[PDB]
Design a protein around this motif. Structure first.
Motif, short mmCIF file in Angstrom:
data_model
loop_
_atom_site.label_atom_id
_atom_site.label_comp_id
_atom_site.label_asym_id
_atom_site.label_seq_id
_atom_site.Cartn_x
_atom_site.Cartn_y
_atom_site.Cartn_z
N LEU A 2 -3.88 10.02 6.44
CA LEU A 2 -4.40 10.57 7.69
C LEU A 2 -3.96 12.00 7.98
CD1 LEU A 2 -4.96 7.52 7.95
CD2 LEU A 2 -4.70 7.84 10.43
N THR A 13 4.35 14.25 13.40
CA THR A 13 4.24 12.85 13.79
C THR A 13 3.55 12.68 15.14
OG1 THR A 13 6.09 11.99 12.49
CG2 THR A 13 5.59 10.85 14.56
N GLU A 49 -0.04 12.83 14.49
CA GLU A 49 -0.46 11.62 13.79
C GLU A 49 -0.65 10.44 14.74
OE1 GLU A 49 2.49 11.14 10.71
OE2 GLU A 49 1.29 12.27 9.25
N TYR A 50 0.13 10.39 15.82
CA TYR A 50 -0.14 9.47 16.94
C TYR A 50 -1.48 9.82 17.59
CZ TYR A 50 4.90 8.27 17.05
OH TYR A 50 6.17 7.84 16.72
N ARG A 107 -4.77 9.13 15.39
CA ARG A 107 -5.13 7.71 15.37
C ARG A 107 -5.52 7.27 16.77
NH1 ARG A 107 -0.12 5.98 11.22
NH2 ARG A 107 -0.45 7.92 10.03
N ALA A 151 0.10 3.82 1.91
CA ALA A 151 0.00 4.36 3.26
C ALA A 151 1.20 3.95 4.15
CB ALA A 151 -1.31 3.90 3.89
N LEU A 152 2.29 3.52 3.53
CA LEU A 152 3.47 3.04 4.25
C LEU A 152 4.65 3.99 4.02
CD1 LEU A 152 4.91 0.87 5.93
CD2 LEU A 152 5.18 -0.46 3.84
N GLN A 153 5.10 4.64 5.10
CA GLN A 153 6.12 5.70 5.04
C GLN A 153 7.39 5.35 5.82
OE1 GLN A 153 4.01 9.21 6.48
NE2 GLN A 153 3.17 9.68 4.45
N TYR A 154 8.51 5.18 5.11
CA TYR A 154 9.82 5.06 5.75
C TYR A 154 10.42 6.45 5.96
CZ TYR A 154 14.48 3.49 6.94
OH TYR A 154 15.66 3.25 7.60
N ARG A 155 11.20 6.61 7.03
CA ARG A 155 11.73 7.92 7.40
C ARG A 155 13.05 7.84 8.18
NH1 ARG A 155 8.11 12.56 10.58
NH2 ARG A 155 6.75 12.47 8.73
N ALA A 156 13.99 8.70 7.80
CA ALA A 156 15.28 8.84 8.48
C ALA A 156 15.78 10.28 8.37
CB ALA A 156 16.30 7.88 7.89
N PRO A 196 0.81 -1.22 0.00
CA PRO A 196 0.00 0.00 0.00
C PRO A 196 0.85 1.27 0.00
CG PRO A 196 -0.81 -1.55 1.63
CD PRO A 196 0.53 -2.05 1.18
N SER A 231 15.11 15.95 7.09
CA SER A 231 14.24 14.81 7.37
C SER A 231 13.71 14.28 6.04
CB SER A 231 13.09 15.19 8.32
OG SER A 231 12.62 14.06 9.04
#
Ligand SMILES: *C/C=C1/C(=C/c2[nH]c(/C=C3[NH+]=C(/C=C4\NC(=O)C(C=C)=C4C)C(C)=C\3CCC(=O)O)c(CCC(=O)O)c2C)NC(=O)[C@H]1C
Ligand SMILES: *C/C=C1/C(=C/c2[nH]c(/C=C3[NH+]=C(/C=C4\NC(=O)C(C=C)=C4C)C(C)=C\3CCC(=O)O)c(CCC(=O)O)c2C)NC(=O)[C@H]1C
Lengths: 485, 484
Positions: free
Chosen positions: A208, A291, A294-295, A298, A93-98, A91, A106
């Protein structure tokens, strides 16, 4: 079933007004906000295909230079772990981040079909903890709400924060409002559905979060706009940096809103509400703070899903003593009229309906404030045509001749056991809406002050428990039908 | 309706074994773990009444010295904001928290009735990226193994498991992130008794508890009885609570130094636990504990979406057969000769090995079914049964039903006519199921054996899937409408 969209402006599609904005392709702008740069890349090889025009600003080297590089070369240290996060055909709706370094950035990345979409913006590098517990012990829908709105304002320091909840008719109502002392108060104002259109709601169900960091700033296109793979519009929904459609951006300017943001409060796969929040001046939020919301968004969904579902159950128990009595008393006597007619059973108090009517084996019996006889008989006729249990707060809308004799015949609640059936009429209520600018149809409106309307013909809304308690009776009532037949 | 508890050991109550540990008062130990100190205080005045014996270790001054101080004096800077967080008569599931300094200490505080309970212990993009893998986790299992893996990666535990309960208070480890080397519990049902009646109820309200050192001894209070009431102190909301010795031996008997678990609760009911053990003693920083507490409540909201969806996707797989049987049944006068027809696939709707149909006296059968004189006796019992009857073992709901198991094992019954004149039923053959207990299920004390015990229970049959149960009731609504 929302409307299917036109092609965009940058592919020979038509231009936008109130009439056609319902079918606008918001998800494919081919452009982004300046506050951060954006690159796409090949899913398999990792070759960089499309870049933002402002990709030389944050990165530090021209688009012509890097238009053709590979991510193994550009991001040698991230690329190994990055692929493990985003497998093929997953999907969006899947976000990788570093976090990154440059002579900080970011990096948010996601995958749609077979194309990787990167996002770049700066980062500066016990709030939510204590907050989270006040959500748990928030005694009801409203307490939750105002505690929740207050929390976002305290955490992000916005000029305004509202908990928008939708309705069955796609409208909403601001039910909670943390705001600056000075600003106009929207608290308790219904806005029409059209203000958040068909497809926008559907896009906010999957993704979201979205924002606007600067309402007045111009967009930044891509290089190229069409995805060299497909040669077609680029899906930018999952990107934070997406260009907010100009219609809404004016809608925002017309309120007097520099920076906007909102988070999806979704429950049972359905867009239940939004946490709307505006600022006055331009405002680019650090990814950490985004973020944290976003916690909380949800999280706030999981509380509504508990606070709504519970607050009806507590009401349900308040009307199960009357149900208990009417269960036994109805199953006894042969006379169906002369049992339910009795004011001892409080057949009006179960629903709090101003009037009721009972029909069994030809005889039509009434109680309470009800319309004249020749009227009632015509009202019986229509209910025989209606298929399926009928319920409405405005009978006039479901039946044109029902708008007549409104004093008694306004609201309604019908159930079948149409030879032997039940019904509860409700008197007309002079309800007074609080729109933020009127509900009829030029362009986006400039007026957002407190507009009322005094719609006549509508009646008190049936509470979720009052709707269900009637159906619980329908199961146990029809079981007592066989004692006659 | 769990059992009501005995008084504790420190108030002349009885001592604990397998028989009586069901009714143990775990919430009132009157003692804590050494890794952190604990103080109570007056709700109104803020006077410190009860202190831990080890309150001189972290704070740095004796219990006799401070036994009588006021929080306005001791915590002058926190006390103003602290009271605003915890109003009178609130729930005990509300925890205020701040960081402190001493010549550092994380401070967790909550309020029960009219008494404030403080907690003291030291403090020195993971969850962000993780949270999204939870969202796009395609099913119950994928979610689980991603979830277990996440906690292990984040906390560096030797073991992490997703325990999910059952209707019979048992469970089953469905996911397992662990050290390569340790025994694998993955797929093992443990009996209900391993997590007792009240414990489950206490883990419903409070979402976290731990044990940082299995072998270390407890630290009592000074005094034990709350000078206000002169009665046991409610310590459920405290992280530092003394884990009951029974379970602490249960943990030692597996070979577990440090343990922890987080409540996965959905619809007001304790659905499961995220069980996690270490080998050596392990005191977790409060920051890391909070990170799991997000993830546990988060993980609850995903199960509530992943279960509810994964049944709906199955529900749609058996609504074509329902669509056909809706129309065909409403047509013909003959109720037997319509549902008897293999065109409707009345067996394929349930996948039941055998079925029986009863309408207006005539009893008709199809599939592998027991002999006639047997069936007639099976009809008799169903007439006594009140209410739609469903069971994977008919023998347990009817002693004479355990007979002729080959055919008469499982069951699924539905009524059309009120009473049992015109009704439906689906028999199911016997299944030789093989459980995987972590040590056996019969009843000395807590067990030392935790290896892979099987049992081959005969009489039980394939379990009815939530969709298979509901689809049958959907038919019952539309079928009885064709009775008229
Ligand atoms: C005919 C076109 C119209 C225009 C379309 C439109 N609007 C949006 C996005 C939003 N509209 C919202 C409406 C509100 N803003 C508020 O501040 C409040 C209450 C205080 C309401 C009810 C909201 C909340 C959004 C979400 C974005 C945000 O919160 O910042 C879109 C979709 C934009 C996008 O992301 O692609 C569109 C097409 N707005 C109209 O009202 C009509 C005239
Ligand atoms: C006769 C009394 C008995 C005792 C009952 C008991 N159990 C608990 C709390 C827990 N028991 C657990 C059992 C498991 N640990 C596992 O790792 C697995 C499966 C892999 C199971 C089934 C668990 C997980 C808990 C929660 C704490 C934890 O270990 O993380 C208590 C309460 C202890 C307390 O919190 O004070 C009690 C009284 N256990 C028995 O087996 C019987 C003999």
């Amino acid at each position: 079933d929302p409307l299917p969209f036109f092609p965009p402006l940058y592919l020979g599609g038509p231009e936008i007004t109130t009439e056609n904005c319902e079918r606008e392709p918001i998800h494919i702008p081919g452009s982004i906000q300046p506050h951060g740069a954006l690159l796409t890349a090949d899913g398999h090889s990792g070759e960089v295909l499309q870049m933002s025009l402002n990709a030389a600003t944050f990165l530090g080297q021209e688009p012509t230079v890097l238009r053709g590089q590979t991510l193994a070369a550009l991001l040698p240290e991230q690329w190994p772990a990055l692929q493990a996060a985003l497998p093929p055909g997953c999907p969006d709706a899947l976000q990788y981040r570093a976090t990154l370094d440059w002579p900080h950035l970011s990096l948010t990345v996601h995958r749609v079909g077979e194309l990787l979409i990167l996002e770049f913006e700066p980062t500066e590098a016990h709030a939510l903890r204590n907050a989270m517990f006040a959500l748990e012990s928030a005694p009801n829908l409203r307490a939750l709400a105002e505690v929740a709105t207050q929390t976002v304002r305290e955490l992000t320091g916005f000029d305004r924060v509202m908990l928008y909840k939708f309705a069955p008719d796609a409208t909403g109502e601001v039910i909670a409002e943390a705001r600056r002392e000075g600003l106009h108060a929207f608290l308790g104002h219904r806005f029409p559905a059209s203000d958040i259109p068909a497809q926008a709601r559907a896009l906010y169900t999957r993704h979201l979060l979205r924002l606007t960091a600067d309402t007045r700033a111009a967009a930044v296109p891509l290089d190229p706009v069409l995805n060299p793979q497909t040669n077609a519009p680029t899906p930018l929904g999952g990107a934070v940096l997406r260009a907010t459609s100009p219609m809404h951006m004016q809608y925002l300017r017309n309120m007097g809103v520099g920076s906007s943001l909102s988070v999806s409060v979704v429950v049972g796969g359905q867009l239940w509400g939004l946490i709307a929040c505006h600022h006055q001046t331009p405002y680019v939020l650090p990814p950490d703070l985004r973020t944290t919301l976003e916690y909380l968004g949800r999280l706030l969904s999981l509380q509504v899903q508990v606070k709504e579902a519970a607050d009806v159950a507590a009401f349900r128990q308040s009307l199960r003593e009357h149900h208990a009595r009417v269960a036994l008393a109805a199953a006894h006597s042969l006379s169906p009229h002369d049992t339910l007619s009795d004011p001892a059973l409080d057949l009006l108090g179960l629903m709090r309906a101003g009037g009721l009517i009972l029909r069994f084996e030809g005889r039509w019996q009434t109680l309470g404030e009800v319309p004249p006889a020749p009227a009632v008989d015509a009202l019986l006729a229509w209910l025989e045509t209606q298929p399926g249990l009928v319920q409405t707060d405005a009978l006039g809308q479901l039946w044109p001749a029902g708008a007549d004799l409104a004093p008694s015949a306004a609201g309604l609640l019908a159930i079948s056991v149409w030879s032997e059936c039940l019904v509860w009429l409700r008197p007309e209520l002079r309800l007074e809406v609080a729109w933020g600018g009127a509900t009829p149809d030029l362009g986006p409106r400039h007026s957002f002050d407190t507009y009322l309307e005094e719609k006549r013909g509508y009646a008190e809304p049936w509470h979720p428990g009052e709707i269900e308690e009637a159906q619980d009776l329908r199961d146990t009532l029809t079981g007592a039908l066989e004692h006659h037949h």
